[PDB]
Each structure stands twice: as structure tokens, then as C-alpha cells.
Enzyme design. Structure first.
Site, PDB file in Angstrom:
ATOM      1  N   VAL A   1      -5.629   4.871   9.196  1.00 49.85           N
ATOM      2  CA  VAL A   1      -6.514   6.001   8.941  1.00 49.85           C
ATOM      3  C   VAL A   1      -6.917   6.687  10.241  1.00 49.85           C
ATOM      4  O   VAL A   1      -7.270   7.872  10.229  1.00 49.85           O
ATOM      5  CB  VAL A   1      -7.739   5.578   8.107  1.00 49.85           C
ATOM      6  CG1 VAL A   1      -7.324   5.288   6.667  1.00 49.85           C
ATOM      7  CG2 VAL A   1      -8.431   4.372   8.719  1.00 49.85           C
ATOM      8  N   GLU A   2      -6.873   5.973  11.368  1.00 54.07           N
ATOM      9  CA  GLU A   2      -7.068   6.619  12.661  1.00 54.07           C
ATOM     10  C   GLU A   2      -6.098   7.781  12.840  1.00 54.07           C
ATOM     11  O   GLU A   2      -6.477   8.848  13.341  1.00 54.07           O
ATOM     12  CB  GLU A   2      -6.876   5.598  13.782  1.00 54.07           C
ATOM     13  CG  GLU A   2      -8.006   4.589  13.905  1.00 54.07           C
ATOM     14  CD  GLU A   2      -7.766   3.325  13.099  1.00 54.07           C
ATOM     15  OE1 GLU A   2      -7.115   3.403  12.036  1.00 54.07           O
ATOM     16  OE2 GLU A   2      -8.242   2.252  13.527  1.00 54.07           O
TER      17      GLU A   2
ATOM     18  N   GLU B   1       0.824  -1.203   0.000  1.00 57.83           N
ATOM     19  CA  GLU B   1       0.000   0.000   0.000  1.00 57.83           C
ATOM     20  C   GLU B   1       0.860   1.256   0.000  1.00 57.83           C
ATOM     21  O   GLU B   1       0.579   2.211  -0.732  1.00 57.83           O
ATOM     22  CB  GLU B   1      -0.911   0.007   1.226  1.00 57.83           C
ATOM     23  CG  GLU B   1      -2.212  -0.741   1.054  1.00 57.83           C
ATOM     24  CD  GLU B   1      -3.076  -0.653   2.294  1.00 57.83           C
ATOM     25  OE1 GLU B   1      -2.637  -1.141   3.358  1.00 57.83           O
ATOM     26  OE2 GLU B   1      -4.184  -0.087   2.209  1.00 57.83           O
TER      27      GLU B   1
ATOM     28  N   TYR C   1     -13.042  28.540   4.847  1.00 59.35           N
ATOM     29  CA  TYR C   1     -13.150  27.112   4.561  1.00 59.35           C
ATOM     30  C   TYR C   1     -12.048  26.628   3.624  1.00 59.35           C
ATOM     31  O   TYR C   1     -11.736  25.432   3.620  1.00 59.35           O
ATOM     32  CB  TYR C   1     -14.550  26.763   4.035  1.00 59.35           C
ATOM     33  CG  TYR C   1     -15.010  27.512   2.797  1.00 59.35           C
ATOM     34  CD1 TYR C   1     -14.214  27.587   1.669  1.00 59.35           C
ATOM     35  CD2 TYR C   1     -16.257  28.123   2.752  1.00 59.35           C
ATOM     36  CE1 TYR C   1     -14.628  28.261   0.541  1.00 59.35           C
ATOM     37  CE2 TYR C   1     -16.684  28.795   1.619  1.00 59.35           C
ATOM     38  CZ  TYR C   1     -15.858  28.857   0.517  1.00 59.35           C
ATOM     39  OH  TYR C   1     -16.249  29.517  -0.623  1.00 59.35           O
TER      40      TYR C   1
ATOM     41  N   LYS D   1     -11.567   5.235   3.371  1.00 54.94           N
ATOM     42  CA  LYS D   1     -10.711   4.452   2.484  1.00 54.94           C
ATOM     43  C   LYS D   1     -11.637   3.685   1.552  1.00 54.94           C
ATOM     44  O   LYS D   1     -12.123   2.604   1.905  1.00 54.94           O
ATOM     45  CB  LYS D   1      -9.854   3.492   3.304  1.00 54.94           C
ATOM     46  CG  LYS D   1      -8.466   3.230   2.742  1.00 54.94           C
ATOM     47  CD  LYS D   1      -7.598   2.540   3.784  1.00 54.94           C
ATOM     48  CE  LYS D   1      -6.343   1.933   3.180  1.00 54.94           C
ATOM     49  NZ  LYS D   1      -5.785   0.863   4.052  1.00 54.94           N
TER      50      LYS D   1
HETATM   51  N1  LIG Z   1     -16.563  30.474   6.301  1.00 58.59           N
HETATM   52  C1  LIG Z   1     -16.439  30.940   5.022  1.00 58.59           C
HETATM   53  N2  LIG Z   1     -15.276  30.838   4.419  1.00 58.59           N
HETATM   54  C2  LIG Z   1     -15.109  31.283   3.186  1.00 58.59           C
HETATM   55  C3  LIG Z   1     -16.181  31.868   2.501  1.00 58.59           C
HETATM   56  C4  LIG Z   1     -17.417  31.967   3.163  1.00 58.59           C
HETATM   57  O1  LIG Z   1     -18.379  32.461   2.615  1.00 58.59           O
HETATM   58  N3  LIG Z   1     -17.514  31.499   4.418  1.00 58.59           N
HETATM   59  N4  LIG Z   1     -16.027  32.319   1.229  1.00 58.59           N
HETATM   60  C5  LIG Z   1     -14.898  32.243   0.627  1.00 58.59           C
HETATM   61  C6  LIG Z   1     -14.815  32.467  -0.859  1.00 58.59           C
HETATM   62  O2  LIG Z   1     -15.769  33.444  -1.262  1.00 58.59           O
HETATM   63  C7  LIG Z   1     -13.625  32.012   1.390  1.00 58.59           C
HETATM   64  N5  LIG Z   1     -13.891  31.164   2.557  1.00 58.59           N
HETATM   65  N1  LIG Z   2      -8.814  -0.056  12.239  1.00 58.81           N
HETATM   66  C1  LIG Z   2      -8.027  -0.169  11.130  1.00 58.81           C
HETATM   67  N2  LIG Z   2      -7.901  -1.349  10.572  1.00 58.81           N
HETATM   68  C2  LIG Z   2      -7.144  -1.518   9.501  1.00 58.81           C
HETATM   69  C3  LIG Z   2      -6.463  -0.430   8.940  1.00 58.81           C
HETATM   70  C4  LIG Z   2      -6.617   0.834   9.545  1.00 58.81           C
HETATM   71  O1  LIG Z   2      -6.054   1.813   9.097  1.00 58.81           O
HETATM   72  N3  LIG Z   2      -7.399   0.929  10.639  1.00 58.81           N
HETATM   73  N4  LIG Z   2      -5.699  -0.594   7.827  1.00 58.81           N
HETATM   74  C5  LIG Z   2      -5.488  -1.754   7.325  1.00 58.81           C
HETATM   75  C6  LIG Z   2      -4.886  -1.896   5.949  1.00 58.81           C
HETATM   76  O2  LIG Z   2      -3.937  -0.863   5.709  1.00 58.81           O
HETATM   77  C7  LIG Z   2      -5.846  -3.003   8.084  1.00 58.81           C
HETATM   78  N5  LIG Z   2      -7.025  -2.758   8.918  1.00 58.81           N
END
Ligand SMILES: Nc1nc2c(c(=O)[nH]1)N=C(CO)CN2
Ligand SMILES: Nc1nc2c(c(=O)[nH]1)N=C(CO)CN2
Ligand SMILES: Nc1nc2c(c(=O)[nH]1)N=C(CO)CN2
Ligand SMILES: Nc1nc2c(c(=O)[nH]1)N=C(CO)CN2
Ligand SMILES: Nc1nc2c(c(=O)[nH]1)N=C(CO)CN2
Ligand SMILES: Nc1nc2c(c(=O)[nH]1)N=C(CO)CN2
Ligand SMILES: Nc1nc2c(c(=O)[nH]1)N=C(CO)CN2
Ligand SMILES: Nc1nc2c(c(=O)[nH]1)N=C(CO)CN2
Lengths: 120, 120, 120, 120, 120, 120, 120, 120
Positions: free
Chosen positions: E72-73, E21, E53, E99
Site C-alpha cells: 500500500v506504500e 491476495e 475534484y 486496507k
Molecule cells: N475544485 C472544485 N472542483 C469541482 C467543483 C467545485 O466546485 N470545485 N465542482 C464541480 C461540479 O460542480 C467539478 N469539480
Molecule cells: N508496511 C506494510 N506491511 C504489510 C503490507 C504492506 O502493504 N505494507 N502488506 C502486507 C500484506 O499484503 C504485509 N504487511
């Protein structure tokens, strides 16, 4: 030849054979394909050697939302007509007009009409 | 007549006719079709007899993300030219360049140009 | 011209050029189209004059899950050959083999090969 | 020529090769295309120059829900026969009969037959 | 309280327990939700009273594409930590790391971990 | 309590903090939830014991399409205000303003702000 | 609490009240949620402090495909029992079992049962 | 607090405030959730310890297809009342009635009402 597409234009219109359709209205959708030479637009980067896709959208809106016909066939024919009169560089066009919520008791995704028109 | 497809490649680019588009950027999508014989590759399991689909992706990414054009027609044309100049087994390719969020006031899924090209 | 379809078969397989792919495996999808005359089956309601679509699915599963090739071109070629060897009431077949999660750094729907084969 | 579409009609039917299917039932879908000259209707906005799409739906509902065949092939053949026999204006029609939930142990979206019928 | 969402961010990363992976990579998706008072921002229309954002997206992209973990945790834990580190106006955040194409023989949409973290 | 929903209203607006957004415009979406007692309307079948969901749509349409704000926060706050100001029968509402195509270099489904408001 | 998800697992089983279902089989789907502290796994990047999501998938596959119950309720109950019997770190789990193609004459997406079970 | 779901039931009905709706009809969708104890049913695999979801669907079909109200509120209230009147084991139910194609000139996915009821 080469093609410009506009996928899934959505309008609210009042077309229909039933008078109840003519005052309630309903969704209409259109899939537009126009055929034209785009080679030279792609090599020149000059929009003026193609057709502004925004105008094609406006042409459809004008027919679907600012006209009221009985049949969707008439929506298709009028769009195809308007395209060919206004854009000489367009050789053929395919117009698909979709009625997704027709007054048919049943279960289905939609009904639609599709025509292809070119220049005599 | 055999085909390699790359469906719905997505990129963030800055192409567009309006200067405001060149500054903000937006999504672009590309559907790629190339035509070439795959029977020999299929019977030999040897990639030398086909085209690496990963190189076709990189070729598209460079036109869409590393360049800026006014028209999507130019994206499709440059992709098609680069494919036919680089790849000697490919006799024809169809390139669809999609603009899913164009600056058109209205309701629709996408606008797109599609071309087909072969070498003279 | 009559056609039997099997849309979006999904299997887990271990094909790929990279040894890492052969170890981890991944999703593979197949779209199957076979052409044959169906009028006789349609007007007689007799399966003997058609092709059992369950046998077609099993044919595809065996190639995709019981074999390991390096190219997806080899999956399609082996499905098409096995189709035509086993039913010569089928005149033609189009096999699309899809790799939805290839190891390509980027954003896309999937990569696919598609072939059409008929008897020489 | 021009076309009328009815997309993704859904019915619950009892067709099937296995008697177990014949009493449990399952979903069936139909994609209908008919080909005819819509130029008249588009010009005149008169439904008598086209084919009422509601009548086409009812025709399909009769074959799928009011009767029971062993094969999907028979569904399509009977829809096509009934269509070409009731409308002189229709030159060709294509019927795709989809079985989304067949009793095939595996993973897929659907199986289907597609036929195309004109006049001998 | 009020919320800011970023739905279905998509990245390509090399996280995973298996060395295969770490070599090939795969898709990763993130769903982000952060909580804070947005009233004054909606009252004043002044971004100084909310959280850009776009900076929240870059924060997530950095963890998924500029870092590599076994689990991924750890992706979710490092996103949540960086958020609370860098944007004190956020009271709480829920990170969902998806994933979609793990190396699991079977049929499924995706696996995911989801955590919620808060200011001590 | 009982709820009225309007799911996935779509508009074209000119909001955004960048002046280029105020010129080009872009899609905007709204999910509307209002809470109120619907039992009476349920037993009486009388709309006057409820709120016309079409009026709610028009109320959302003005804020999104007839005004220009820098922040989606302002859109959400102004819809919630107009609802609580005009519909005494509604004790609480949740407004989700969605920006599906923001100018963020990257890949995602959408960004959104969500608020909940009741009367002090 | 922190959550591990497995979305939309798809299996083919023979569960059903009607004996015909036990012979034909049909699609079954499962949505799994388990709750446990993930923050030590997130901080150490060590799977020993979490639950291998691939083990959870196999546990569901075993109940859905290696046994035949009359009711979906028994499937949900046995999955939950097996999870809580094996993973002491899991304090709670929610199991949704979905029958997308039940033998119900009508039109719908699916029927499902959902249970939540927690630890003593 | 275990749950039985029936997702996305689809019916054709004639409800609506405007007489034009009562003539044409339109699609209506229902999402049903009923709460009850499924442990006894899951341990025993005995349908008598739960509620046949086939009957619940029929109960919903009755209200939407065999009756006509002015408000969707009345549809929801009558489904809930008939559920709690007929099934002692159900302690609470949540009914969402969806109108996907209302006569509102605009663009949206659907309107809906949602109520939760238990025995007083
Ligand atoms: N919270 C929030 N963030 C932003 C916003 C928005 O309206 N609200 N607008 C943007 C681009 O226009 C830039 N980022
Ligand atoms: N809880 C958890 N389990 C898994 C994970 C993972 O990231 N979290 N990844 C795996 C394969 O890469 C094997 N299983
Ligand atoms: N071919 C066709 N058939 C119809 C049409 C229509 O527009 N075209 N409209 C109807 C309901 O308004 C009735 N059936
Ligand atoms: N044919 C075509 N038309 C357009 C195009 C374009 O790229 N091609 N771009 C636009 C706005 O950028 C305006 N309209
Ligand atoms: N045409 C083609 N190209 C590839 C293929 C393949 O199977 N066919 N496999 C690869 C990764 O396994 C990468 N490149
Ligand atoms: N070609 C075809 N094959 C089948 C069919 C069918 O209708 N057509 N039905 C089956 C299960 O009922 C078995 N396989
Ligand atoms: N609650 C419930 N009801 C049912 C069930 C079931 O599994 N659970 N199975 C049936 C068809 O097998 C029909 N009725
Ligand atoms: N709350 C509510 N409002 C409405 C309804 C309705 O059923 N419920 N029906 C209408 C058109 O029939 C428009 N207004």
C-alpha cells in the site's frame, strides 16, 4: 403489499405539551411507509401508476412544520389522514414520528409514536 | 424460509424521472433477500444445493448500472424478474431499491421502494 | 416467544469455497436468536431456569474458529444443530452468519445467510 | 395496534450473576415498546387519552438503577409487570434489556433478552 | 493553505504481498487532501483557478483499480507522484491508503499508510 | 485561541458547475470554526462578550441556500468574508464546505473544500 | 514524516486498578501510529524497506492480552517501548490505549491515554 | 505532552440564555483532554504518578449537572479552572463543551465551544 419508504425525514417543529416547547422548538423526525401495488409501475416505467415519493415528503413537511399540536400522536394521525384522503391507490400506511431530544432528564436515543391506518 | 442476504449493495446509475437525473447520475443502493432451502447445502457443504451469492450480486449490478429507467420501481421489478427467471431453487425474493440522494429539497436519509415476488 | 440475543459476534475464520480463502482467512460475524420461556427465570432470578448466554457465545466461537467449512450455510446449520442438541429448553433458534469482506469485486455491506430451525 | 417507543435508554446498574459485577456496575440499555389505541389522542390532542412517555421512562429507571437483580431476565420481567399493572390502556408491551459490556471474553456488540407480555 | 478533500474513496483492488491476495482482491479506501490557494477561485467562481475534484478522484481510481502493487506504500507513492505530475497548482498532498480487510487474524478497524509529498 | 464550532450544518442548495446541478439541487454541508477570546464570556457568563452561535448559523444559511455559485470555493469564501466583516471580535475562521453527493461516477463519502481566513 | 496506522484494534484484557476488573476483564482498544520514511518502500515495492504492519499488530496484542497491568498507562508505555526497541527505522510512535467500558458510574463513550515516544 | 482523554461524556443540564431552556433542560456533552507526564506512571504502574480519570469525570459532572450557567463558555471555563486548581501535575487542559440539541431552527449536528488553559 409493495411499499414506498421515506427514511428519517427531519423537521424543526414547535409541537409539545409544555408551552416552553411551543416557543423553543426542537427536532422532529418521521419514518413513512405506504403500501400500494407497484407491479404495474415497475412494468410500465410510468410514475403515474405509482405515488410520487416527493409529494409524500411534502405532505409530511406540511404537517410537522406548518402545524403545531401538543402530542406527537396528533402529528402521526394527521399525516396518516392526509395520505389516505389524497392518494386513493394507497391501501395502508405506517407513520412513525420521532422526538429525538425530548425534555426528559435522562439518557436515551429518542421517543417515538407509530401508528398504522387504512381505509374503512 | 431460509434466506440469503446481500446488504447495501451500492451502484452509480442514471435512473430517474427528471432528465437532469439521467445525465448526472447518482448513488443507488439495493438490499437483496432471496428465499430457498439452505438445509441441504448446509449439511452437504455443496454449493450446487444453494445459489452463489456472487452471481446474485452480478445480476443486480447489471440492472442498476447497465440499464436506465425512469422509476426505481422498474429497477426492483427487473431485478426480481431476472432472479426468478434465472434461479430455480428460489421461491421468493424481496428487493429494496434505495435512492439515498434524491432531488428533493429537504432533509432525510433516503427514499426507497420494496417489493416481494414469487413465481405463479 | 421470549428471546435471548447475541448481536454481532465477530470471529476470524478460514471458511470459503476458494482455496485462497482457506489460506488467508477473513472476518465472520454471527447474529444469534434463541427462543425459550424466560418468565420463570425472570420471576425467580435463577439462571438454572434460563440459558447462560456465555455458553451460547462459546458454542458459536467453536464452530466459526475451530472448524473450516466451504459454505457459510454450513456454519449456520452447525450452530443451530448444536444449539438444539445441547438445550431442549430452547424451542427454536435463528442463526445469521455474515461475511463482511467476501471476494466479490464490488461495493456492499456484507453477504449473509439466515436459517431458523426447530426440533422435528 | 398503535405503539409508543422509548429507544435505547441508557442506565448504569449493578445487576449481574457474579458478585464482582454487583459492585463494579456496568452499562444497561432498554428498548421499550407498548401497544395501545392512540386514535383517541391523535384525534383530540389530549394527553389523558394516551400514556405520558416520561412516566414510562421513570418506571424503567426505577427498575434498572434503584434495584439489583442477578439476571437481565428479571429486569425485563419487572419492567413489564410494572407497566401492565399501572396502565389499563396498554394491552401488550415488549421489553428488550441489553447488556453492552458483559464479562464475556470475546468480540460482540451486546447480549440481550427480549420478552413480550400481555394479560393472562 | 486552503485544502480540497475527498473523503473515504472506496475501490476494489488486488494489491498485496501474498499471491492469494493478488487473486481474490479486497476493498481499498483512500483519503485525499491537496493544498493550494483557493482565494482567487472563491473570488471569481471560475474553476480554471482551482482543480476539478472529479479529475482527482479518477486519478486515485486509476492507481488503485488500474494498477497492482505489492505494498500500500506504493499505492500512496504513485498517487502522490501522479498528482504532482499532472496538477502543478497543488503545492502539497497527503495520501492515506486504507486496507480495511487485510489477512490479519485479529479484531481491528483497518490498517493504513499515510504520506505527505510536496513540489521540490 | 478559543474556538466556537458549528458541526455538520446541512442545507439544500443549487450550486455546481453543471447546469443540471443548478436545476436539481443537492445536499450541502458546512463545518464552521471561529477563533476568538472566550475567557471574558467564561468568567462573566455574558453573551455580549462572545458571539451568538445562532447568528453564525443564519449567516451560513444565507450563503448556501439564498445564493447560487458554481464553485463550493465561492461558498466557503463568502461565508468567511461575511464572518470577518461582521464580527470584529473574531480574528480567524475556518470554513469547510462539504458536497456529500457530487455527480462523480464512483464510490466515496464526500468531497470538500476548506479555507482559513484572518484579517490582513 | 510518513505514517503507518492501525485503527481501533480491539482486545479483551484484565487490566485494572480494582481487583474485580482483574477477574472479570473488559474490552480494550488501541490506536497505533508509527513514523518512518516510506518513500523507498513506495518506490521499490519491497517490504524490506518498511515495517510489516501485521508484526505491529501482534506486538500490541502481546502487551494487551498476554499481560495484566493496573494502569492503561503501563500498556501504552510497554507498546511504545517494544516498537522502538525492535524497529530502528521507526523514529516516533503515538499509542492511544482506550478503555471503552470503565467502571465509572455515568455516561460517556470511553476514557483513554495517549503517549508519543521518539528515538534518541 | 502525554494526554488523558475522556470522550463524549453525556449529561442532562439546564444551561442556556433563554429562560425556557432553564426549565426544560437538554443534553450536554463534554470532551476532556488533560496534558501531563505519564512516563513515571507507565514505568511504575502506580496510579499515584498520574490522575484518576474517575475523578476527572466527577469534576466534569459537577459543573454540568450541579450548576446552571447562561453560556456553554462558562461551563468550559469552570471545568478548566477546577482542573488546574486541583491537579498540580496537569500542565494544560482542553475542554470542548457540546450542545447537540440547541434551540436553533435548522439542521446540524451540534454547536460547541473549545478552550485551552494552562497556568499563567
Ligand atoms: N475544485 C472544485 N472542483 C469541482 C467543483 C467545485 O466546485 N470545485 N465542482 C464541480 C461540479 O460542480 C467539478 N469539480
Ligand atoms: N508496511 C506494510 N506491511 C504489510 C503490507 C504492506 O502493504 N505494507 N502488506 C502486507 C500484506 O499484503 C504485509 N504487511
Ligand atoms: N404519549 C405522549 N406523551 C408525552 C408527549 C406526547 O406527545 N405524547 N409529550 C410530552 C412532552 O411534550 C409529554 N409526554
Ligand atoms: N414512486 C416514485 N416516485 C418518484 C420516483 C420514482 O422512481 N418512484 N422518482 C422521482 C424522481 O426521479 C420522482 N418520484
Ligand atoms: N450461497 C453461497 N454462495 C457462495 C458462498 C457461500 O458460502 N454460500 N461462498 C462463496 C465464496 O466462498 C461464493 N458463493
Ligand atoms: N440468560 C442469562 N445468562 C447470563 C446472565 C443473565 O443475566 N442471563 N448473566 C450472566 C452474567 O452476569 C451469566 N449469563
Ligand atoms: N489515569 C488513570 N486513572 C485510572 C486508571 C488508569 O488506568 N489510569 N484506572 C482506573 C481503573 O482501573 C481508574 N483510574
Ligand atoms: N456563544 C454562545 N452563544 C449562544 C449561547 C451560548 O451558550 N454560547 N447560548 C444560546 C442559547 O442558550 C445562543 N447563543
Amino acid at each position: 403489499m409493495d411499499k414506498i419508504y421515506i427514511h428519517d425525514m427531519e423537521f424543526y417543529g414547535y409541537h409539545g405539551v409544555f408551552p416552553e416547547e411551543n416557543k423553543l422548538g426542537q427536532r422532529f423526525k418521521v419514518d413513512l411507509t405506504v403500501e400500494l401495488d407497484l407491479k404495474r409501475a415497475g412494468e410500465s416505467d410510468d410514475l403515474e401508476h405509482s405515488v410520487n415519493y416527493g409529494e409524500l415528503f411534502e405532505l409530511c413537511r406540511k404537517v410537522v412544520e406548518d402545524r403545531t399540536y401538543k402530542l406527537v400522536e396528533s402529528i402521526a394521525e394527521n399525516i396518516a389522514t392526509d395520505i389516505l384522503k389524497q392518494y386513493e391507490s394507497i391501501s395502508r400506511c405506517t407513520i412513525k414520528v420521532i422526538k429525538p431530544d425530548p425534555p426528559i432528564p435522562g439518557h436515551y436515543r429518542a421517543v417515538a409514536v407509530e401508528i398504522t391506518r387504512e381505509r374503512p
